[PDB]
Amino acid sequence: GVPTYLLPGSGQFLTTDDHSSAPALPCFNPTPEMHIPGQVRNMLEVVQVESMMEINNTESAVGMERLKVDISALTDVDQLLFNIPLDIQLDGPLRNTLVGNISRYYTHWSGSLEMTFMFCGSFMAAGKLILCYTPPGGSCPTTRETAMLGTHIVWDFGLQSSVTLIIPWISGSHYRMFNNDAKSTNANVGYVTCFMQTNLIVPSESSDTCSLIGFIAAKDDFSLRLMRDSPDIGQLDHLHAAEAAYQ
Amino acid sequence: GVPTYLLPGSGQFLTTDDHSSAPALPCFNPTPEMHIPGQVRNMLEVVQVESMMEINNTESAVGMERLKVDISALTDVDQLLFNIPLDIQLDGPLRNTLVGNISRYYTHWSGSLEMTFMFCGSFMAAGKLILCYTPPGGSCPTTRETAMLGTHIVWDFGLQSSVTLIIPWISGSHYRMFNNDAKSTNANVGYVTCFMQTNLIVPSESSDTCSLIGFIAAKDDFSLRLMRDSPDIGQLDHLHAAEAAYQ
Amino acid sequence: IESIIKTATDTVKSEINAELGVVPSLNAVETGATSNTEPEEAIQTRTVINQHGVSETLVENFLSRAALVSKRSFEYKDHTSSTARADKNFFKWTINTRSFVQLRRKLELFTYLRFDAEITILTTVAVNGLPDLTLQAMFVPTGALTPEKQDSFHWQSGSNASVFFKISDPPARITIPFMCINSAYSVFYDGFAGFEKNGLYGINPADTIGNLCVRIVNEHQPVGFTVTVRVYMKPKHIKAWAPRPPRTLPYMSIANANYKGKERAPNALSAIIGNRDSVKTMPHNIVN
Amino acid sequence: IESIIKTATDTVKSEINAELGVVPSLNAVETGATSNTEPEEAIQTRTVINQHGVSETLVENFLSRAALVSKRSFEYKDHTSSTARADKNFFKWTINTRSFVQLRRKLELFTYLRFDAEITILTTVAVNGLPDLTLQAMFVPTGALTPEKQDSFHWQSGSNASVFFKISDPPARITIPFMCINSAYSVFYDGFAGFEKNGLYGINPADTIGNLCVRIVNEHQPVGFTVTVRVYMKPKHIKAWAPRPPRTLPYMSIANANYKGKERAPNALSAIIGNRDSVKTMPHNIVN
Amino acid sequence: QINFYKDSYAASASKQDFSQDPSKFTEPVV
Amino acid sequence: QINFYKDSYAASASKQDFSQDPSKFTEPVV
Amino acid sequence: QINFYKDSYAASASKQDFSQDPSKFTEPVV
Amino acid sequence: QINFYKDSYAASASKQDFSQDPSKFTEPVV
């Protein structure tokens, strides 16, 4: 017949191989395809949707207080309000986001991010903020004179209640890794900080402690590769009733 | 020669695989095909044939009394005569039918049914019946005012001795399952009930207890998939003389 | 009207029908014809483009699933002291669809079948380490000379189609052709095989494929093994004629259609379908 | 606008923009739309021809990785003295994506999935030499008759798609088709299966594939073996609808989406993301 | 599909005959 | 790629559908 | 059928020679 | 015949060179 020989790699079950396999139910007629709304054909559709950052990932912020940042009227000039760890691949405010949870199924990621901050004060509350994306290399900037040298956006509080801090893809490498080393040149992204441009100024009938909801999506520049399993989920024992699926 | 490698699934005997195998008797000449009458090329030919329901699946109906429903003259108004469990896949009056026994070789079924009721009274016996297919969700309707809101047919007893209660395919899903759960939204079909429209009225020389033979076939809408082995047959031990087939 | 039907038929929409003379729900069972009342003709329907394929109900796809037809655990040891009834390292088997009831009830749905048997012989072994035994499965025709020993000279297979296979190999699959002298296998044979009145009723030998004499080619080893040989038949290239009522009662024997039924319903003689309380009692009722 | 996107999009160069009326950084989250501020529109960019392929983020490539769905070590021995709870040389398994959390969280990213299961059954054996056991993995539908013994007559497989395979062979790989009665598998089923109020919440049986009854075809051998049968499911031909928040809290059960969370952050109930000192405290700070 | 044998019965199962005639069963009348 | 089976679901994974529409998610507004 | 060898005798059996002449046996006369 | 390798020496034996010249042995004279 046909003179063949087995290569190395014969009879091995690679999990990610793509080969046609034997149909269990022959001449099966699957259910006809109905137009179900909202088909995802590519996971970067899911990533480019905005999703809330937990910038307030502190203690004494229990549950939903972690999603908003309380900013107040300040008596000092040009004070730091918050800074955001930009490690998508590591634990931090970007982790439980749509750009974060999907990228923790991957290792190498590229493309520009997109931070959107929705002010949730009163309509009478007037204020201005600066949102400085500092490219990495140095420490997180604590004064505004240090931070506004980087990429920033200055935001007035009026009719439109949100800016977009585009985090540009500034990297030497084409992609960026996970390493468990947040301080690596291949993994570190930079630092987004926020400072009072002027101040949060409310009248006597508005609440003095207004809020900021911080979103992050990715852009059309964004890309992911080198798929891995997510570290966001674990499994110590069998789940409950999993033994009852066999009974 | 040809560089090959064994996939997962090599050397395994799937029962339902479709591969050309080695002929035991080479250059065999099979017997020439003769036109034998009544070829079935598709099992839905067998299903679309009418076949008697055992609506009288009670005790004290021994054998053939289960195939007919005894209806009588009634002194009360608008009384229930019979109701039919519509679970083809489960045990009930539809089980020992051509639509039932073939569909118990399958799991998922679609398409409209077809109940035909042949009156077998005298020619002098005059009567009227309503045959209400109630789509599922609620209880089996016990009064006629409850049941005639559903799909029904009103049937006069004259020259033609049979109606067709078309059970329309009313389902959310494309198909319907077997589950051993007759009360499931994926499995339950509804309830066919029968009520006296007027009454069964016989003269003094006809028998007061006339009969109804209930048929069910399927329509051209009907369909079956996900083939399984039938629960209608079992095998506890070896059959008799099966050891003598080896001797 | 013979027509090619790949999917289930569409449902046309219909409107309010109030017409004298045309009574499509009224039909005649006494003619023997199944009622041609369309769902459009009975109730008021919408337009439904039905895309449900009918391909899994094909009789080819119905019966071409390799089902079990034979199973013998037989001892593999010294048979110098064993009785002259057990398998002395070989078994003959008249190839018989009737031994196992799942394939039997499927093949007894029809009266006449024209199929090619795709015999797959799965041999499996247990100890009374496992050996890699070689097995011969010599196909003997119906009534021809079957061997008497393991090492008898009938196994030389001058013309009988032996298949030699190992336990460590994939299962031996051969294709027995359509081997009836008639144009179809008489699944039910209302009649007798012999011209005298001693013939067995229902057993047409033309329906019988033949013998499947299976021995273990190796000699006897010092420890005994229990070798179980499962035979799986896949009917293929199937033409089927005259369908029948599916058998409801349990089978009693492989030689005939005797019936006893269960003691109680379901599948009993006096009551095939399981009983309920009354004809107006709904067993699975949605009570909220 | 539906468009074919094979690589990530290029970045056009931009210049100094000082324009009234056009404020592309200012956007409205309250509309629900994600901000359309291009990087050209926010900062001053160069021309970048981005050649980064987006092909590994395809939902086909996302979910078609054969992940573990079942795992049972079960004893293979004489079961004449064992209790009537353990596996007497066979196990039934209702095929269930929910048992193992890596594939479960990936499939619970979406609401509706339309995939073909590429079931790979890896059987591995340990001694309590190794035998070359033959295994049957009979695919039973949801709720149908599952076998009661190892050598019961349900394993004859008249129509259920059994796959017979050995330990020494490569792992048995079959393709379960898209077997939902609906047009997609309801991964989350906000509703009840039954019409009565006793039905289990969230468990749609249409989402359930079926049973995977797996026995060892060999008889019991004089020494006992612990046979571990791992089942690997590869979703393929995948269409996916309505993505969801990925589950952050640990799973509690396979039947529902109950949550307890970790005791402390990360992945706790009161604190999903791990805590830090203040909102103005940078945890991984480059201090030189 | 493949059929490298010299016998036409040795091929794979012919699961393509979609011609059906139910009218010799549902309407067997003249 | 290869697909010597008689069933179209039995083929290899269709890793070629590069059509995406993020504007039903990023811009779901009217 | 297949015959990937370099020798024509190494091929499969030639079960195609349907030419027969019984008249050199049944009618061997002149 | 088959030769799915990238090296021409890795092929099967070339048993086709029927050119012979015995006259450089049987008649080696000028």
Q: Please tell me the distance from the alpha carbon of residue C221 to that of residue A208, in angstroms, as a whole number.
A: 94
- B229/D161 Cα distance (integer angstroms): 9
- The C-alpha of F23 sits at a distance from chain A's nearest C-alpha, in angstroms, of 8
Beta-strand pair B162-167/B113-119 = antiparallel
Q: What is the CATH number of domain C1-288?
A: 2.60.120.20
Which residues, 6 or more positions from D125, have their beta carbon under 8 angstroms from its beta carbon?
D76, D131, D133, D167, D225, D226, D227, D228
| φ/ψ of residue B167, rounded to 5 | -90, 105
Distance (Å) of CA B193 to CA B98, B149, C41 = 21, 12, 21
H or E stretch at A80? strand A80-85
**Bond from prior residue into D266 cis (ω within 30 degrees of 0):** yes
Rounded distance between C-alpha atoms, residue A219 and residue A44, angstroms: 9
Chains C and D touch each other (3 or more Cβ pairs < 8 A): yes
CA proximity to E26, closest of A27, B42, B53: B42
Judge whether C205 and C259 are in contact, CB under 8 Å: no
Q: How many domains does chain B contain in total?
A: 1
Q: Does G18 touch chain H (CB under 8 A)?
A: no
- Helices marked H in D76-218 — which ranges? 101-107
Separation of alpha carbons B242 and B235, rounded Å: 13
Q: Contact A31/D180 with Cβ under 8 angstroms?
A: yes
What secondary structure, in 3-state letters, does C252-271 show?
CECCCCCECCECCCCCECCC
Backbone angles phi, psi at B236, to 5 degrees: -85, -50
- Cβ-defined contact of C252 to B240 (cutoff 8 Å): yes
Q: Which of C169, C280, A212, A101 is nearest to B55 (CA)?
A: C280
If DSSP codes are grouped into helix, strand and coil, which group holds residue A243?
coil
Instruction: Give start and end residues of each alpha helix (H) in B19-121.
Output: 44-47, 98-103
β-bridge partners, D215: D90, D136
* Residue of C161, C193, C165 whose CA lies nearest to C179: C161
Q: Is C41 helix (H, G, I), strand (E, B) or coil?
A: helix
For residue C133, the one-letter residue type is L
Tell me whether residues C53 and A29 touch, CB distance under 8 A: yes
Instruction: For residue B205, give every residue at least 6 positions away whose Cβ sits within 8 Å of its Cβ, in sequence order, or none.
Output: B124
Q: Tokens in use for C55?
A: 């391909």
Q: Which residue in the block uniquely carries the two structure tokens 């009785």? A: C83
d(Cα D282, Cα C250) in Å, to the nearest integer?
A: 77
Half-sphere exposure of A32 (CA within 13 A, CB side): 14
Please answer yes or no on whether E19 and C32 come within 8 Å at the CB atom: no
E15 and chain A in contact, CB less than 8 A? yes
What type of residue is D195?
Answer: F
Q: Quick one: tokens of D138?
A: 């009979």
Question: At B150, which CATH number?
Answer: 2.60.120.20
Q: Quick one: residue H3, left, alpha or beta (phi over 0 = left, psi -120 to 50 = alpha)?
A: left
Encoded tokens for D136: 């049957």
- Helix, strand, coil shares of chain E, percent, nearest 5, are 20, 5, 75
Query: Phi, psi at residue A100, to the nearest 5°?
Result: -90, -45
Q: Any alpha helices (H) in chain C, and if so which ranges?
A: 39-42, 59-63, 101-107
Say which residue the tokens 């031996």 belong to: C172
**Long-range contacts of C149-158, Cβ-Cβ distance < 8 Å, separation of 24 or more:** C149/C88, C149/C90, C150/C79, C150/C88, C150/C89, C150/C90, C150/C215, C150/C216, C151/C219, C154/C213, C155/C213, C155/C215
Report the SS3 class of residue C105.
helix
Whole-number Å distance between alpha carbons of D103 and D234 = 10
Q: What angle do CA D84, D89, D92 make, to 5 degrees?
A: 80
Residue B27, Ramachandran bin (φ over 0: left; ψ between -120 and 50: alpha; else beta) = left
Instruction: Tell me the DSSP string of D13-49.
Output: -------SS--SS---STT-PPP---HHHHS----B-
The answer, for C56 touching chain A at a CB cutoff of 8 Å, is yes
Closest approach of chain E CAs to the CA of A23, in angstroms? 14
Q: C211-237 burial, b for 16+ CB within 10 Å, e for fewer?
A: bbbbbbbbebeeeebbbbbbbbbbbbb
Q: Do A23 and F10 touch (CB under 8 A)?
A: yes
Q: Which residues contact A183 (CB under 8 A, 6 or more apart)?
A: D284, D286
The two tokens of residue C280 are 């107006």
* Residue C255: C-alpha distances to residues B240, B244, C250 (Å): 8, 10, 14
Antiparallel, parallel or unpaired: β A39-40 and D225-243? antiparallel
Give whole-number Cα distances, C24 to B159, B162, B220, C177, D112, in Å: 14, 11, 16, 48, 42
Asked whether B88 and B189 are in contact (CB, 8 A), the reply is yes
Residues 6+ apart with CB under 8 A from B64: none
Q: Which two tokens stand for residue A247?
A: 């009974």
Q: Which residue of A has its CA nearest to B12?
A: A22
Distance CA A185, CA A91 (A): 17
Q: How far apart are CA A87 and CA D103, in angstroms?
A: 25
Give, in degrees to the nearest 5, the angle at Cα B116 between B112 and B117. Answer: 150
Q: How many helices (H) and strands (E) does chain H have?
A: 0, 0
**Expt. technique:** cryo-EM
CA dihedral C38, C43, C48, C50 (to 10 degrees): -40
User: How buried is residue E1: exposed, middle or buried, by Cβ count under 10 Å (0-12/13-18/19+)?
Assistant: exposed
Main-chain phi, psi angles of D86, to 5 degrees: -80, 170
Q: A229: buried, middle or exposed (CB in 10 Å: 19+, 13-18, 0-12)?
A: middle
Q: What is the DSSP string of D220-279?
A: PPSS-EEEEEEEEEEEEEEEEEEE-PPP-SPB-BSSS--B--BSSSSSBSS-SSPPBS-T
CA distance C72 to C125: 11
Whether D contacts G, i.e. 3 or more CB pairs less than 8 A apart, is no
Q: Are B162 and C25 in contact (CB under 8 A)?
A: no
Q: Distance (Å, rounded) from C-alpha B187 to C-alpha B172? A: 11
Evaluate the CA torsion angle B166, B171, B176, B179 in order and state its sign.
negative
Taking the Cβ of residue F6 and every Cβ of chain E, the question of whether any pair is shorter than 8 Å is answered with: yes
Spatial separation of the C-alpha atoms in residues A132 and A129, rounded to whole Å:
10
User: What CA–CA distance (Å, rounded) separates A51 from A216?
Assistant: 5
Euclidean distance between CA atoms B24 and A102, whole angstroms: 56
The answer for residues whose C-beta is within 8 angstroms of residue D167's C-beta and 6 or more apart is D123, D124, D125, D130, D131, D132, D133, D135
Pseudo-torsion of CA C95, C100, C102, C103, nearest 10°?
Answer: 0
Resolution (A): 3.2
The domain in which residue B83 lies consists of 1-247
Question: Which of A2, A233, A213, A216 has its CA nearest to residue A119?
Answer: A213
Spell out a b/e string for D6-26, using b for 16 or more CB atoms within 10 Å of the CB, else e: eebbebeebeeeeeeeeebbb
C–E: how many Cβ contacts below 8 A? 59
Do G and C share at least 3 CB pairs under 8 Å?
no
Name the amino acid, one letter, at C15: E
Q: Rounded distance, CA C67 to CA C71, Å?
A: 12
Neighbours of D245 (CB within 10 A): 12
CA torsion angle for C20, C24, C27, C32 (degrees, to 10)? 140
Residue D51: CB atoms within 10 A of its CB come to 10
Chains contacting A (3+ CB pairs below 8 angstroms): B, C, D, E, F, G
Structure tokens at C71: 């199973």
The pair of three-digit structure tokens given for residue C133, joined into one six-digit string = 């035994």
Quote the minimal CA–CA distance from A21 to chain D in Å.
Answer: 6
